[PDB]
Amino acid sequence: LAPSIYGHDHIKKAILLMLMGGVEKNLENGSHLRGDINILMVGDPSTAKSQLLRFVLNTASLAIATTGRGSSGVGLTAAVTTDRETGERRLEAGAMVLADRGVVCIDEFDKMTDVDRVAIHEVMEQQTVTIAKAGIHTTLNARCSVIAAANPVFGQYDVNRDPHQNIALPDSLLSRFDLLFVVTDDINEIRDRSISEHVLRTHRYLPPGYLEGEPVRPKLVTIPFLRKYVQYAKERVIPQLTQEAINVIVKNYTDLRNDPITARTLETLIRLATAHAKVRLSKTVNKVDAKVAANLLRFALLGE
Amino acid sequence: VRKDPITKEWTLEGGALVLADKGVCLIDEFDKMNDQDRTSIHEAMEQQSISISKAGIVTTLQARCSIIAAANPNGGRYNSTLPLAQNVSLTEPILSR
Amino acid sequence: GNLDVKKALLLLLVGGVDKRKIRGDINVCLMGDPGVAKSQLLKAICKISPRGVYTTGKLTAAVMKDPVTDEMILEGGALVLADNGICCIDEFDKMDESDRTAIHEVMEQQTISISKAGINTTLNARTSILAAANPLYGRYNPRLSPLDNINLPAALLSRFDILFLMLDIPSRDDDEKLAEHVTYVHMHNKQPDLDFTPVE
Amino acid sequence: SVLAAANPIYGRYDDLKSPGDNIDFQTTILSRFDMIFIVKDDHNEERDISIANHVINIHTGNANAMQNQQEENGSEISIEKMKRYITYCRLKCAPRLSPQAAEKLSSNFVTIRKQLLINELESTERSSIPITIRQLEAIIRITESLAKLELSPIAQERHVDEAIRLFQASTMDAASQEIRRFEQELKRRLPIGWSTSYQTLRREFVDTQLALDKALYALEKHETIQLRHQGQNIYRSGV
Amino acid sequence: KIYPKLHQMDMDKVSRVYADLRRESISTGSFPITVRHLESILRIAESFAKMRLSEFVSSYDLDRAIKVVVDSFVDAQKVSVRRQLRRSFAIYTLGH
Numbered sequence: 012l013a014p015s016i017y018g019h020d021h022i023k024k025a026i027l028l029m030l031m032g033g034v035e036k037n038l039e040n041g042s043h044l045r046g047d048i049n050i051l052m053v054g055d056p057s058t059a060k061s062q063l064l065r066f067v068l069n070t071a072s073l074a075i076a077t078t079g080r081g082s083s084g085v086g087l088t089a090a091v092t093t094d095r096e097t098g099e100r101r102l103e104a105g106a107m108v109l110a111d112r113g114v115v116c117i118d119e120f121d122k123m124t125d126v127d128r129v130a131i132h133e134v135m136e137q138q139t140v141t142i143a144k145a146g147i148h149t150t151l152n153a154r155c156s157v158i159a160a161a162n163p164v165f166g167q168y169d170v171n172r173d174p175h176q177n178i179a180l181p182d183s184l185l186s187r188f189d190l191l192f193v194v195t196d197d198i199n200e201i202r203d204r205s206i207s208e209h210v211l212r213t214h215r216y217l218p219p220g221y222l223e224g225e226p227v228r229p230k231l232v233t234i235p236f237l238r239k240y241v242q243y244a245k246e247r248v249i250p251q252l253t254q255e256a257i258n259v260i261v262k263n264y265t266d267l268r269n270d271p272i273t274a275r276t277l278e279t280l281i282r283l284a285t286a287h288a289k290v291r292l293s294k295t296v297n298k299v300d301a302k303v304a305a306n307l308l309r310f311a312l313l314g315e
Numbered sequence: 316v317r318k319d320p321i322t323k324e325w326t327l328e329g330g331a332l333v334l335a336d337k338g339v340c341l342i343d344e345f346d347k348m349n350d351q352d353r354t355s356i357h358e359a360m361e362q363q364s365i366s367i368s369k370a371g372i373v374t375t376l377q378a379r380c381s382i383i384a385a386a387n388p389n390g391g392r393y394n395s396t397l398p399l400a401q402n403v404s405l406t407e408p409i410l411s412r
Numbered sequence: 413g414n415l416d417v418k419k420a421l422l423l424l425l426v427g428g429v430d431k432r433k434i435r436g437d438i439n440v441c442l443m444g445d446p447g448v449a450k451s452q453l454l455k456a457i458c459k460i461s462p463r464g465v466y467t468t469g470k471l472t473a474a475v476m477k478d479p480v481t482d483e484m485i486l487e488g489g490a491l492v493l494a495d496n497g498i499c500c501i502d503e504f505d506k507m508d509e510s511d512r513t514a515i516h517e518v519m520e521q522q523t524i525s526i527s528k529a530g531i532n533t534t535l536n537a538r539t540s541i542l543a544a545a546n547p548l549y550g551r552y553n554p555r556l557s558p559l560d561n562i563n564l565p566a567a568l569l570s571r572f573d574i575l576f577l578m579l580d581i582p583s584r585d586d587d588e589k590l591a592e593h594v595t596y597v598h599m600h601n602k603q604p605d606l607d608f609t610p611v612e
Numbered sequence: 613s614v615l616a617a618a619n620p621i622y623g624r625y626d627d628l629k630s631p632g633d634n635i636d637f638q639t640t641i642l643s644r645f646d647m648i649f650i651v652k653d654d655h656n657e658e659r660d661i662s663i664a665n666h667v668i669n670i671h672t673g674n675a676n677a678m679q680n681q682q683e684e685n686g687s688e689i690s691i692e693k694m695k696r697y698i699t700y701c702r703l704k705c706a707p708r709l710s711p712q713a714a715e716k717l718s719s720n721f722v723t724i725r726k727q728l729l730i731n732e733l734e735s736t737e738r739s740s741i742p743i744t745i746r747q748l749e750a751i752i753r754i755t756e757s758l759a760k761l762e763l764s765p766i767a768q769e770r771h772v773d774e775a776i777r778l779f780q781a782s783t784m785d786a787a788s789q790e791i792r793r794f795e796q797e798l799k800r801r802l803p804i805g806w807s808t809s810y811q812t813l814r815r816e817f818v819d820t821q822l823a824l825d826k827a828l829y830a831l832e833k834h835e836t837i838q839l840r841h842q843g844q845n846i847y848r849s850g851v
Numbered sequence: 852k853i854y855p856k857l858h859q860m861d862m863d864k865v866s867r868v869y870a871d872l873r874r875e876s877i878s879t880g881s882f883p884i885t886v887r888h889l890e891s892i893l894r895i896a897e898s899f900a901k902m903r904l905s906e907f908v909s910s911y912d913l914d915r916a917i918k919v920v921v922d923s924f925v926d927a928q929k930v931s932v933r934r935q936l937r938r939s940f941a942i943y944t945l946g947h
């Protein structure tokens with residue numbers, strides 16, 4: 012994933028598992044547990060957050076791009092319009108509905124007005140949006156992985172202050188994301204040398220057949236192969252949970268919690284393990300999947 | 316810019332510095348303006364134009380005004396033991412104009 | 413667990429005794445952390461009651477004309493649907509002042525008034541209020557007051573008959589049990605056996 | 613391309629105040645500018661005399677003839693021809709960097725990042741004007757544009773030198789902006805007209821320790837000290 | 852109707868006036884002398900030539916313009932320095 016982005020290994024791992032989200036559960040009385048993995052990248056400028064969103068936009072089977080200022084809350088859920096073919100009031104699907112059984116990319120997410128973010132909540136919590144206006148009283152499916160990019164309230168992350176003080180969003184919204192990643196452009200000569208020489212190799216690219224300086228019109232898979240692998244794993248394997256994985260999950264969840272952690276953290280660990288089982292193309296979730304899921308969520312929570 | 320009531324589209328309406336183009340504009344009690352209102356003056360007061368870009372309108376109007384303004388110092392009265400920038404709250408970019 | 417809360421929640425449904433007025437309604441607020449997931453408990457007892465209704469702070473009556481046709485109607489809010497029943501106010505700390513004053517009038521007079529569009533009325537609201545509220549900054553600090561932790565005003569909290577601050581405390585004991593319960597639900601697509609038989 | 617013009621907070625730059633207090637813009641929006649120029653009235657009298665003679669030559673109408681002579685002499689080109697030429701460069705050429713240009717740019721990035729790190733330590737706060745990997749791409753774009761003038765299909769060492777110089781002249785210059793005991797110690801122990809070789813002062817102060825270079829910067833801005841002889845000799849030149 | 856040209860310009864006088872105004876304006880709170888004030892001297896001289904309906908700016912127009920701009924600058928200063936500054940600037944203006 013994103014071979015032109017240096018570093019960010021744990022984020023690209025989380026992105027891969029988010030492209031391959033865990034199985035959705037349906038229970039008694041039609042009770043529902045969501046299977047999407049919702050990611051928030053918050054951090055310093057020039058940390059490839061937007062570029063990672065643009066890679067996801069180019070890699071998922073069904074992705075809808077949005078930006079904080081450019082998005083209305085109505086433009087996000089669904090909008091009433093008159094169908095001039097007949098003259099009746101009809102709903103027009105917004106970004107969250109168009110991304111159903113897909114993903115939504117949100118750049119500049121903390122720049123949203125809060126009457127927009129009030130409309131995010133039902134998609135995250137219930138994978139649905141409800142309309143109660145214009146004599147139209149309906150509920151629409153919005154079952155999709157939100158991946159979002161944001162900055163702190165200050166221009167860069169301030170390690171002197173708490174995450175709720177650094178991060179603009181309410182805790183009632185942050186708790187709905189599966190993985191909250193904090194990234195920084197923290198200066199270091201070795202890492203700066205590495206990222207720099209990588210970026211220069213990236214900028215020295217020339218696509219085939221073009222002349223030198225002409226304007227445009229260690230094993231790794233190709234992006235078409237990767238897209239096919241994701242489609243295969245989404246369609247053809249539904250990993251079943253297994254006790255040997257449960258033991259790792261409960262051990263890690265209790266350890267993480269008994270040192271920000273909350274009840275929602277547990278099914279996030281289950282989702283990450285289930286998605287990693289999909290990466291193995293395996294009919295069962297196993298102890299390896301729980302170990303990787305706990306390692307990755309531990310990175311996200313502790314900055315490990 | 317206004318949503319035109321008979322044309323149902325956006326159109327411009329010239330402010331005082333359009334109405335007084337090739338003329339004078341007279342802002343009495345200049346120190347009482349809200350600073351967001353005051354700082355609208357700048358382009359018309361030096362570049363002698365107004366460059367609106369709103370609601371899909373994008374154009375530059377002529378605003379060839381000599382502006383004469385009247386102000387009281389801070390607190391209501393001058394103080395000759397203070398230099399100018401401490402007598403009045405106006406910043407250097409507007410004072411220089 | 414939380415059988416003290418469950419024991420109190422029942423006495424909403426049966427209520428006290430009214431007399432010539434003296435009132436039968438009983439009101440309770442479930443404060444504290446959102447990680448306890450109190451919303452599902454409100455949902456449950458809302459379904460138990462024969463007349464109740466589930467709502468969010470995100471309630472007042474209004475002359476809500478132009479519903480489908482351009483047309484006149486008076487909307488009795490959820491507090492009037494809950495007349496002779498339970499109004500389950502989820503997200504109780506998030507409500508706005510019009511709804512706060514609506515809750516004030518029903519919790520005192522058991523009515524909600526209108527003085528709008530020429531219509532001047534008092535709608536009947538003999539309702540019991542079940543509420544759930546969550547703290548500022550996400551998680552409740554136990555050493556600080558509820559007034560420090562939660563957006564609600566003290567005078568309104570004083571009018572509730574029971575106040576339960578159900579916190580979420582990490583525990584090497586409880587967390588294994590909750591984890592095994594939840595993972596059973598994920599692994600078998602149904603809840604585990606309860607060690608007792610419930611009433612439907 | 614976004615070309616933007618702004619005044620600082622307090623209108624005039626207010627040099628003795630912190631840049632984080634003078635600059636309204638958040639570090640997010642600032643990082644999206646390849647080059648940030650901080651422009652100041654120098655108040656130098658020779659410069660002001662020169663500007664006055666020039667501006668008078670504008671208002672007198674002398675400049676109308678001067679520009680025409682400059683254009684016909686081939687030292688200047690007109691609006692029209694330059695407009696067409698920018699279009700032609702934007703459509704013909706789009707140069708790459710040579711490997712040598714790439715290495716020089718990479719090492720320059722780590723160099724300016726180190727400078728920003730030590731400045732943030734010396735001022736004990738995150739800088740308002742940032743240096744980020746996006747700003748390496750700023751120097752890359754500037755390098756390419758400089759090669760794009762002459763329609764050279766590759767950028768070279770010379771173009772990288774000019775790109776680095778411009779970035780140093782603009783964004784770095786924007787970023788660039790107990791000792792009281794040590795300075796009076798140096799005033800006591802080095803009288804007027806004599807030289808202390810720097811390394812001995814470093815040993816003596818360390819033997820009492822970064823206050824040294826702040827003291828030297830302050831005393832060098834003042835007339836009291838002069839860094840003679842390749843910076844080796846601390847010379848008590850003034851008072 | 853009237854558009855006065857600058858001519859025969861006392862370039863050195865306006866240059867010295869602006870240079871001194873800039874130097875003495877380094878006082879942190881003073882009226883902030885800037886290049887638009889230099890152009891203001893020329894606008895004011897042109898306006899005085901306009902008052903005479905004269906298509907050329909005489910030395911009298913320019914000298915009156917310098918007197919206005921210098922007095923406007925001097926008048927804005929605090930009493931602690933205004934006498935010294937007015938004495939210093941007098942060479943440009945009390946020659947008229």
Ligand SMILES: Nc1ncnc2c1ncn2[C@@H]1O[C@H](COP(=O)(O)OP(=O)(O)NP(=O)(O)O)[C@@H](O)[C@H]1O
Pocket residue numbers: 015016017018019054055056057058059060061062063160161162206210640643745746749
């Ligand atoms: N690790 C990296 N490897 C390669 N390029 C990078 C890396 N990090 C940042 N960049 C470059 O930085 C530029 C800006 O990336 P972008 O994704 O817009 O940053 P961002 O995190 O979204 N910053 P912002 O939108 O201001 O919060 C792009 O041209 C990237 O190629």
Ligand SMILES: [Mg+2]
Pocket residue numbers: 060061062118119160
């Ligand atoms: Mg971004």
